[PDB]
Amino acid sequence: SNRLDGKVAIITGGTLGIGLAIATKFVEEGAKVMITDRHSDVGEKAAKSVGTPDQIQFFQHDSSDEDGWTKLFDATEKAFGPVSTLVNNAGIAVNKSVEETTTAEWRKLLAVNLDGVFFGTRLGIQRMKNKGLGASIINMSSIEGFVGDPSLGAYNASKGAVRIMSKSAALDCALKDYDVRVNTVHPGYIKTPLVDDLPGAEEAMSQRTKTPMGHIGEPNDIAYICVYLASNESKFATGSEFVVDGGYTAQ
Amino acid sequence: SNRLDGKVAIITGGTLGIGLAIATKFVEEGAKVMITDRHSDVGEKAAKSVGTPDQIQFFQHDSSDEDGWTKLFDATEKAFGPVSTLVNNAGIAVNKSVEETTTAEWRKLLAVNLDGVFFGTRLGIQRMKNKGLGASIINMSSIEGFVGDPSLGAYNASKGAVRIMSKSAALDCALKDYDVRVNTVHPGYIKTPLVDDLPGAEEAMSQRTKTPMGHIGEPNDIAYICVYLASNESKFATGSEFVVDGGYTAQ
Amino acid sequence: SNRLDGKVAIITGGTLGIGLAIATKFVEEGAKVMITDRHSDVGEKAAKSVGTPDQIQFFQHDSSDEDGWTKLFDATEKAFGPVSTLVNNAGIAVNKSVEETTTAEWRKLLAVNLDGVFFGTRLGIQRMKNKGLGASIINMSSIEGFVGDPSLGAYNASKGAVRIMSKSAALDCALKDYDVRVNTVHPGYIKTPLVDDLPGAEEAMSQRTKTPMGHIGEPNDIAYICVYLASNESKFATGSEFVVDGGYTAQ
Amino acid sequence: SNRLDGKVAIITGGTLGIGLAIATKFVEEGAKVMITDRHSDVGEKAAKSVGTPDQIQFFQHDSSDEDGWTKLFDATEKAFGPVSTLVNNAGIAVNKSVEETTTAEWRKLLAVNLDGVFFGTRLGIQRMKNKGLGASIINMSSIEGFVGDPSLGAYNASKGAVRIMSKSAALDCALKDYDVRVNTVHPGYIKTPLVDDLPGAEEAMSQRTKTPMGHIGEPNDIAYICVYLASNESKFATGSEFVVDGGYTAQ
Ligand SMILES: NC(=O)c1ccc[n+]([C@@H]2O[C@H](COP(=O)([O-])OP(=O)(O)OC[C@H]3O[C@@H](n4cnc5c(N)ncnc54)[C@H](O)[C@@H]3O)[C@@H](O)[C@H]2O)c1
Ligand SMILES: NC(=O)c1ccc[n+]([C@@H]2O[C@H](COP(=O)([O-])OP(=O)(O)OC[C@H]3O[C@@H](n4cnc5c(N)ncnc54)[C@H](O)[C@@H]3O)[C@@H](O)[C@H]2O)c1
Ligand SMILES: NC(=O)c1ccc[n+]([C@@H]2O[C@H](COP(=O)([O-])OP(=O)(O)OC[C@H]3O[C@@H](n4cnc5c(N)ncnc54)[C@H](O)[C@@H]3O)[C@@H](O)[C@H]2O)c1
Ligand SMILES: NC(=O)c1ccc[n+]([C@@H]2O[C@H](COP(=O)([O-])OP(=O)(O)OC[C@H]3O[C@@H](n4cnc5c(N)ncnc54)[C@H](O)[C@@H]3O)[C@@H](O)[C@H]2O)c1
Ligand SMILES: CC(=O)c1ccccc1
Ligand SMILES: CC(=O)c1ccccc1
Ligand SMILES: CC(=O)c1ccccc1
Ligand SMILES: CC(=O)c1ccccc1
Numbered sequence A, B, C, D: 001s002n003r004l005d006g007k008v009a010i011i012t013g014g015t016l017g018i019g020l021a022i023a024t025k026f027v028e029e030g031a032k033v034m035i036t037d038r039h040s041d042v043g044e045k046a047a048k049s050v051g052t053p054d055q056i057q058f059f060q061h062d063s064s065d066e067d068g069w070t071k072l073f074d075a076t077e078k079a080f081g082p083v084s085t086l087v088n089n090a091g092i093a094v095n096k097s098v099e100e101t102t103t104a105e106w107r108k109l110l111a112v113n114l115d116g117v118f119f120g121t122r123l124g125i126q127r128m129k130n131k132g133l134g135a136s137i138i139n140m141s142s143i144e145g146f147v148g149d150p151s152l153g154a155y156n157a158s159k160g161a162v163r164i165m166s167k168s169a170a171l172d173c174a175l176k177d178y179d180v181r182v183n184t185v186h187p188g189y190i191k192t193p194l195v196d197d198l199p200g201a202e203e204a205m206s207q208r209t210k211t212p213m214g215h216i217g218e219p220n221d222i223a224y225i226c227v228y229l230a231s232n233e234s235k236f237a238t239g240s241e242f243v244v245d246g247g248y249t250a251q
């Protein structure tokens, strides 16, 4: 309770799985929240499932859409006052090796996973700096920002980019006394409805050779590290990677 | 509030600075706490400053003392019930290059910073495994576990050792279903009375070439990441490094 | 002598500085070399400065040009036989923070530094796999693939991407028994004519707070690690980062 | 040929496997070499197998023996002139989890793998600094200096320590203009007679979940990266980790 009092957060891809848990816990801690998704049918229901409009709203947006990011910030500020917190969570995967990645797949993934995080980080800094908000940008950056996977070539590119770009932004913010921190969160495999719909997926990810705990995590595992990073508890953490992966990258 | 309900923690070097803040916040979150220090004059006062004996006690112990670690666990369990949480925080520094480190300095530092963390981790696993406690071992492992410093040669050895030994322990615990997690915390420079007593130290550490935020942190910065790691909030985090350094290692 | 016998290498941006030294040493070790650059006036002279057409040729190409990559491989194979070795060295920098990066700057840098390395890596794997060449792809990936710099936001994104994408490609190649290795090289600051033309640059980069050796490196420093990685000497190295930075990332 | 002309190297544990290959290639490149081992029966034969006394000699020494390190340097200098190159290669393993490591096992491993590297690094700096030798200290620091293994607890401690202590030493040497570089080499699994004598070991290490290349390496794989690091080719590399692991740490 109260760990995010007065905060105003945008969470991209906040309508499902990890994003929805982050929104849920954010609201529970006192934050006002705008969640996004490219699809309105999902977002409208999702917000209501978490709370009332005074707590949480939906804004339809594809994070790859530059001009829409401005509209998104404006809508959030209209609803809740100046934004203090941005979680760049929206992402997609292509299940291809580097060898087998089409250029169209490449461009499509980089638009969401890399351009979208860039657009959101850049705008966030511009909108949140110098306001005494204890502003925090949390970029979702995966175990796949640390290690490769033979069948996630473009994904790996996107996640390594986010990992180090976030450091750049953290440093400039720190050096300029912007009162904006930038950090990355690195989930291992997390159980969601989508993983549940992929036959064999959770079992494959739970083999000790993949996740040493022998099971995968749950959305709240990612929500809790996000609360810490959005809160003023983490006011001396910037430019750092926070990994919650059941041991996946420790071996 | 309540984030550590039912937990029983040992914090080595819990009587001053970072250790004392960790103890303070632990108590505030519902944990029972045993703090240690080689010196009784400090520890007795420190416990009382935080809370009552039903919340927090002192046990005199040098973390380099193998046999005393057993006594410590036994005393904690006597006071509060089975231990769920160990923060290996006690440490010393020698201000020498590798070139200029005496063998006596070398052995003395490794006894506290490395043997002591080993003794505590080993015993913790043995005492906490298979009890359904949501057991967590948090090993203090420094920015100096990631980068070198020309005048911290033995310290760097100790902190790199702790960093990777903790991974080993995390993995074995995960693979064996012990219900024990092991992670490391990596503070940058933190303001304490001891730093305050070193003329010029805080200013030197606050230069942008050292800490990009332009200032050093405070004990509570380390306390809050420890709360997260001791709590069940972090139940899928094991084998990972959590850095709170004001940007120091990001550049 | 003879360390690259029978090898056939493409080096992008091989006409100046690091790329030219890599080409020079490659030729000296027995490799046939095709160097590229967007500008013909530079490339023609550069090749001749190193050796004869039977040793080294120029092919005009912007690494951001997908279709030209095919033409490049075809020309190299025509000149020298099947390609065994690719050094993705061409790159540009934008001297902007994330905050201050225009979208046009962003797209332009990612086209050369990220898309171009992707196009070259993908094609290289397709053309070099399963031929018994001891094939090696060496991706230039910078100190800026490890740490951030406040004024290199897009560059940092590109270099982090290359760093982890290269791991993906290495893994798939290894798992499929392609006889292709993929590794990254991470230069610190290196003295070239371009650095010489930037007043104050070498001095700034040589401050101990930047490069602990107190001076910057020279093109041959990067050439020699490339020889090792192109040669069969490195036949068990794949998926790894090789840093030659005068200590820059060690502190 | 000639890549180590004029160099004078000590290689600890130079009589078998990786150490012997490093000695062999060193001699082949023009270096004079003193190899060590605790056992004389092995060392005497080993030297002769590589070359003549004017090229390579044996000195009986346990790297855990502080006072013997001085004797070792003195003997080398007597034979070949001032030492330019030290490869701290001697090491042992205990096949125990942290939980199950006895204190005697702990102390024994740390004596060889950590104290021994410290003694050798410290003395090397003192003996090699300020002599214009292009001095290089290469510390063997394992894949187990990057990731944990549940059954290599003390080993992991030792290898993480070496990894970061080497950075400290590199930095001090660089900052003081000592003309001594310090770097670490990180082998994955390598085929030797000892591995051959462990039934099932090579097959277990060659599973794609362990080594993605599907096979383990050979002693020369480690020799070649050592040649590069001992040579002046690497004169701008210090404080860095060089990994040759068949992909083991890339996934
Ligand atoms: N589910 C897992 O096991 C897992 C594991 C590792 C990492 N991740 C990563 O963590 C993050 C969060 O995952 P999640 O569970 O909310 O995902 P999910 O798989 O359950 O659903 C995908 C999410 O991304 C959003 N999304 C996709 N494209 C978008 C776009 N153009 N604009 C806005 N939103 C978009 C959706 O709203 C949705 O919340 C992602 O960046 C993903 O790359 C997930
Ligand atoms: N103060 C800083 O700026 C800073 C910065 C980086 C890291 N650290 C590290 O963080 C950890 C915590 O620091 P702190 O502020 O509690 O320290 P402090 O500098 O204020 O005081 C030293 C601490 O270590 C304990 N200690 C020392 N030797 C001991 C032994 N043999 N047995 C038991 N206790 C012992 C003391 O109780 C005390 O709490 C340490 O491991 C240290 O290495 C501190
Ligand atoms: N010079 C330094 O101090 C330094 C330091 C760190 C990293 N780097 C990096 O190392 C690599 C090599 O540098 P260099 O010294 O050959 O560079 P240089 O600065 O001397 O000249 C730039 C190089 O890139 C090439 N180039 C640029 N855009 C290109 C395109 N679209 N297509 C083909 N070629 C292109 C040029 O041929 C030229 O060789 C680059 O990836 C760069 O990002 C350089
Ligand atoms: N063999 C592998 O598969 C493998 C894999 C990863 C790492 N390593 C590591 O690489 C290094 C070299 O291995 P190697 O193949 O020469 O080993 P080896 O297993 O074939 O034989 C052990 C080596 O260590 C030496 N040694 C052990 N204790 C010693 C002491 N107290 N003093 C002096 N010498 C001592 C011996 O001379 C011998 O060369 C070691 O540090 C080891 O920890 C080996
Ligand atoms: C972690 C991850 O990227 C992923 C991607 C595609 C399918 C399943 C998992
Ligand atoms: C962080 C650290 O180790 C230190 C050591 C000695 C003095 C001041 C700081
Ligand atoms: C290393 C590097 O990226 C750089 C970029 C621009 C100018 C000078 C150096
Ligand atoms: C790499 C390694 O440490 C090892 C140790 C013991 C047995 C086999 C391998």
Ligand SMILES: [Mg+2]
Binding pocket: A147, A248, A249, A250, A251, D147, D248, D249, D250, D251
């Ligand atoms: Mg791994």
Ligand SMILES: [Mg+2]
Binding pocket: B147, B248, B249, B250, B251, C147, C248, C249, C250, C251
């Ligand atoms: Mg640094």
